[PDB]
């Protein structure tokens, strides 16, 4: 029998999610998981994901399961895949050229996007340079266009590195918020544990 099902409800169902820039980083360790029901549920708009195949994913287990969740506009859900570049893709969260986990996404139009506008989700749109894979960016300091450091006088040209989504209930299907998670699988030299039903 299974000793403990890998906890997924707190992050899939959940009650709240952080913004994409301050994106959460959940770790999962010795356990037994039921990704199969994840395939079974039809509520996932885009379950399609890379690396290991879903049907045999339950037979080659790992040491670390790194689950990272966030929400974005629907249209740039394509911006989560190896090799591609884009505003959310490049300035917030990018993936290595190789990848041993994969992604899931679905719709939350009725949950999120309050009628008057949630306005409680921020994303980076400026930065000095490109972004390393799997690095958190909590830096809440001013960014400059150039030739002028405004020295914390935030305002003119100081370009606050956080612009709001500005959701509305009737913007359109291309802008309605989508909930995205990614499960990266890491095989360290330590013994592998995260494999379940057998």
């Amino acid at each position, epitope marked *: 029998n299974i000793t403990n099902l890998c906890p997924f409800g707190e992050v899939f169902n959940a009650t709240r999610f952080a913004s994409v820039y301050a994106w959460n980083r959940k770790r999962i360790s010795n356990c037994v998981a039921d990704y199969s029901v994840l395939y079974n549920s039809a509520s996932f708009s885009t379950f399609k994901c890379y690396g290991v195949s879903p049907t045999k994913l339950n037979d080659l287990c790992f040491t670390n399961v790194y689950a990272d969740s966030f929400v974005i506009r629907g249209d740039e859900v394509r911006q989560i895949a190896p090799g591609q570049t884009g505003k959310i893709a490049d300035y917030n969260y990018k993936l290595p050229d190789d990848f041993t986990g994969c992604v899931i996404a679905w719709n939350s139009n009725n949950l999120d996007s309050k009628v008057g506008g949630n306005y409680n989700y921020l994303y980076r749109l*400026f930065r000095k340079s490109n972004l390393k894979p799997f690095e958190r960016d909590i830096s809440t300091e001013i960014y400059q266009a150039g030739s002028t450091p405004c020295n914390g006088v935030e305002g*003119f040209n100081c*370009y606050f590195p956080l612009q709001s989504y500005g959701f509305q209930p009737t913007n359109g299907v291309g802008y309605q918020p989508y909930r995205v998670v990614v499960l990266s699988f890491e095989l360290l030299h330590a013994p592998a544990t995260v494999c379940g039903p057998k």
Partner: antibody
Amino acid sequence: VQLVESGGGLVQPGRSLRVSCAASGFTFDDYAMHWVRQTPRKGLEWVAGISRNSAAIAYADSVKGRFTISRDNAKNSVFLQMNGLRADDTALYYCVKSPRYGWGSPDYSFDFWGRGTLVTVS
Amino acid sequence: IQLTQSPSSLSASVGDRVTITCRASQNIGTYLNWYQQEPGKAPKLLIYAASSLQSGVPSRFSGSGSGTDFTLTISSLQPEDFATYCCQQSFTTPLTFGQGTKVEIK
């Protein structure tokens, strides 16, 4: 992306005047607004440009302090109060939007211009 | 800050190799801008940072320069390019233009 202006025309020197410029077709919360002047049959010249969140502002040296600005965030527009009129101010006036992208992405970049209003002081 | 252009004006024909230079009094870097205005309507953005060509614009345009000297270059001149082209300074907040260069037919 369209712009509309009002408040110009023929006025006598020594009075006070007001100019409004509104726009639509984008998200007005960004794209620091600007004003430019052009005297007829001669080189145009920039006037003003302020900020995103009504932050620190700047003006041309020739007319600094004499005129003032206001960012109408609500009805996505901008007010420009003209004080101490001079006959030199007679020109075509443009209210101009700004971009957000590029290499350096400078707010002083100008694009999506409107139409302009004739202003005469005599 | 004083900005100059050369030539002040010119008259050309279709498909010509056009070239206009712009000089700044002090080193501004590259943030200089290139604008056009055709007779009758609203001017639009053409070149920003002296190295970026605007979207939805023919690739025949070209821009270059640095320091204080910059230059627009036209491989094949076209009938729609006979307009007034001007420089723009993107340096310390007081900003001015150049004298411009109207493009005339020859």
